[PDB]
Each structure stands twice: as structure tokens, then as C-alpha cells.
Amino acid sequence: GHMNVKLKVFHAGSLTEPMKAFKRAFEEKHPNVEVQTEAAGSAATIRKVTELGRKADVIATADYTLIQKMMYPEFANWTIMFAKNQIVLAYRNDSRYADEINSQNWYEILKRPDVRFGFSNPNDDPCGYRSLMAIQLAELYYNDPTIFDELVAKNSNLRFSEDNGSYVLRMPSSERIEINKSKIMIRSMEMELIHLVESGELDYFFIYKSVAKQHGFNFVELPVEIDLSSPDYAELYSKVKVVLANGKEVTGKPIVYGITIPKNAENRELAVEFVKLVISEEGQEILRELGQEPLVPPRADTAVPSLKAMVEVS
């Protein structure tokens, strides 16, 4: 009824567990509000607003740059950066060769004929493009130009090209992506890969460390030089770029999650309160307790007057 406001929050799949907690905390403080959350790969999440005509009060992505590239200036005009993450290679203890995989031999294990691994669709999800970026960055770190070629290029129509030191991968439209089902499985968002690994269909999957911890997966920590986790290695991460099917270019960058309130949000006032919760000490703790490092202090890419005291604007 008129005493039941619905705050619509569309978010990155990897924010599914934190969002359950933000929803419960928010509703405890606003008993007449139902936070309606929906998970999807970040680019698909943004398209709900930018292409499907749906209205969301809050958009949260796993890569803040997608808000900038896909929503400015028609649907948003600021982004707050509030959390970080790290790419790892996760598995079950009964996954093929789980007893022998480690940080030094991970790519050789994935190269074994009977081993199947997964990553999400780069056109829809940052985890997916980040997975390909990490594998290509591995060629530089391990000084082995064939790692991406053997793992991905020979099992799909996805290929990195070199252009004066940097490498670029141009994505086919999603409908034209070709995958060798004998080695790889892909899904629209990384969270969808979880059940494939749990059922035994996949042995390993590239995923965020926070999600691996939340879902009880073991994992190999990849070198900081390739795992996109540290601001201090931004110069190395920038050596790889992926051009999504929608034409937007994403460059390897330290993983930083973004949140915004779309310009056409129906319940802006409540959305401001929700964003405040996410970047408050309470929200930082919710993230930390769920195995995801919050960005402290939160930052904004431009002035955000309604939240000036909560953010650092450079």
C-alpha cells in the first residue's frame, strides 16, 4: 500500500551475500521498506536501466568503471567506490587433481585434457573479463606466451592480440561466442558457475576470493602481478584490455566496486540512505565479515553533495 516503499537495488552477482546483509540491516532501520535486490553480471545489471527501460534506485557493480562508461551522462553522473576484490582459481577437494594443484602449477593442471574450468561471459560480467585478463597477465608474469593460447584461445574464439606491449581482446557478440564444451563452460555471471562446480561438471573456476570463501571452495591464490587485487600493480594490470561487444573498452585495473543512484531513480531519498549504509562503518564491517575487503575510506569520482561527509573526492 502507500505505506510500503520498494527500494530497487540491481547489483553485481558477487555482491549477492553482502546485499542480503545490507537488505536486512536497512529494513531493520526502515520497517516500511522492502529492499528488492536482483543479481546479474554488472554489465547486464546496468543494461536493465540503460537499455531495458527499468528503473532502479541503486546500481552496484563489481567494476566502477562500467557505471562511468555505460551510464554517463544519461543515467548517472557520479560513482562511489566502496569495495575491492581479488581473482582466484577455486575448486572442490574432489575436483580433478585438487590434491596436486598449487600456485606454481595451476595453469599446467588446467591444461590437462580431462580438466574442465569455467569463467563468466565478459560481455555481461566483470569477473569474466577479469578472468581472461588474469590468464593473459600470466603470460607476462611467467614469461610464457602460450598460456592464454593453450587454455582459452584453443578452446574458444576468444583471442588476445599484441599491440606494442599491451594486449587487446575484442569480444564477439554474445550470440557468436564459441566455446569448446569439452574444456570450458561459461555462464552470464560468475555466480551461475557455482552450481556447475558443485555438481562436478566443472573442476575449477575463476572467481572472486570473497565468493570462494562464502561458498566454501578451496582456491589457489594467483600472483599479485596477475590477480587484479592491488592498486600498487595498476601499471602491470593496464597491459591488458578487453573490448566488450557493446563497444566499451575495459582495461586491467585493480578491482574496485562502484555504486550509484541512477538519475531516474523513483526513491532517491531512500536510495541515499542505502548508499550511506553501504559505505558506513556498519557496511564496511558487513563486507569484511563476508570475506570482501571494503574500500576505506570510500571514494567518489566527483563531488557528491548529498554524501560529501562520507566520501573522499580527489
Which parts are annotated binding residues?
A: 13-14, 42, 125-127, 190, 208
User: Quick one: CA dihedral 169, 172, 173, 176, positive or negative?
Assistant: negative
Residues 112-141 that bind Mg ion (CB under 5 A): 139
Residue 143 grid cell: 614469461
d(CA 208, CA 131) in angstroms, rounded, equals 9
Hey, what amino acid is at 16? Answer: T
Q: Does 127 bind ligand MOO (CB under 6 A)?
A: yes
CA distances from 281 to 9, 63, 278, 298 (A): 20, 21, 8, 10
Which residues lie closer than 8 Å to 189 by C-beta, 6 or more apart? Answer: 12, 13, 39, 40, 41, 44, 120, 121, 124, 125, 127, 128
d(CA 112, CA 145) in angstroms, rounded, equals 18
Nearest to 87 by CA among 245, 165, 204: 204
Nearer to ligand MOO, 14 or 136 (CB): 14
Residues 162-221 that bind ligand MOO (CB under 6 A): 189-191
Residue 93, classified by CB atoms within 10 Å of its CB into exposed (0-12), middle (13-18) or buried (19+), is exposed
Residues forming beta bridges with residue 187, ordered by sequence position: 120
Strand 240-243 to 249-251 pairing: antiparallel
Q: Which of 37, 42, 229, 260 binds ligand MOO (CB under 6 A)?
A: 42
Nearer to ligand MOO, 30 or 215 (CB): 215
Q: Does 18 bind ligand MOO (CB under 6 A)?
A: no
Least Å distance, CB 62 to ligand MOO, is 4
Residues 60-99 that bind ligand MOO (CB under 6 A): 61-62
| Known binding residues for tungstate | 13-14, 42, 125-127, 190, 208
Least Å distance, CB 188 to ligand MOO, is 8
Q: Which of 103, 145, 180, 198 binds Mg ion (CB under 5 A)?
A: 145
Q: How far apart are the first and last CA of the chain?
A: 43
Nearer to Mg ion, 59 or 158 (CB): 158
Residue 285 grid cell: 564491517
Q: Does 231 bind Mg ion (CB under 5 A)?
A: no
Residue 247 grid cell: 563497444
Least Å distance, CB 125 to ligand MOO, is 4
Residues forming beta bridges with residue 184, ordered by sequence position: 117
Nearest to 39 by CA among 10, 66, 61: 10
Q: Which of 27, 34, 38, 149 binds Mg ion (CB under 5 A)?
A: 149
Nearer to Mg ion, 53 or 165 (CB): 165
148 binds, among Mg ion, ligand MOO, none (CB under 5 to 8 A by kind): Mg ion
Using the contact rule CB under 6 A, the part of the chain among 12-20, 76-84, 225-233, 240-248 near ligand MOO is 12-20
User: Interface with ligand MOO by CB under 6 A: which residues?
Assistant: 12-14, 41-42, 61-62, 125-127, 189-191
User: Interface with Mg ion by CB under 5 A: which residues?
Assistant: 139, 145, 148-149
